Design a protein around this ligand. Structure first.
Ligand code: A1BP0
Ligand code: ZN
Length: 138
């Protein structure tokens, strides 16, 4: 689990969005595994606007932060799960690092701010849903 809180927006993995997120829906994209909802209180986070390919992410299954080298946002095949059919997920960045299904929502950050959140993984890989292109979050 995990969310980004920026301005009057809450960014979460679409497959983990609550009844409340859907009732205050601003934008969602099944192909990116992202959902944005509106909030009344002002958020604590700031978004990176950069081309960084190194950063640090929080891994809840280890209660630890790990440094990562990650690929540019791209279209990657993701096997069927209990939440989605087999499909291509867009705006996804892969990296070598530990992740388990419940790690989704962990924030990836560079020196410029929030880059994205954990969305995929398996076998020593961790994938992050990019949010740096969503300029309207600011
Ligand atoms: C953090 O994700 C994982 C970690 C370890 C193992 C497996 C995973 C993920 N499976 C894959 C095929 O990437 C996973 O559990 N997902 C279920 C929820 C939706 C996710 C998505 N489609 O973006 C996929
Ligand atoms: Zn950066």
């Amino acid at each position: 689990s995990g969310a980004i809180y920026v301005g009057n927006y809450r960014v979460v993995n679409r497959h983990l969005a609550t009844h409340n997120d859907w009732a205050n829906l601003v934008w969602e994209d099944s192909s990116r595994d992202l959902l944005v909802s509106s909030t009344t209180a002002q958020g604590c986070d700031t978004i990176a606007r950069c081309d960084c390919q190194t950063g640090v992410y929080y891994c809840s299954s280890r209660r630890k932060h790990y440094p990562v080298s990650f690929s540019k946002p791209s279209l990657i095949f993701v096997e069927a799960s209990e939440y989605y059919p087999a499909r291509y997920q867009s705006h996804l960045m892969l990296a070598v690092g530990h992740s388990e299904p419940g790690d989704c929502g962990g924030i990836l950050r560079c020196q410029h701010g929030v880059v994205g959140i954990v969305s995929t993984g398996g076998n020593g890989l961790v994938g992050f849903a990019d949010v740096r292109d969503l300029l309207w979050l600011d």
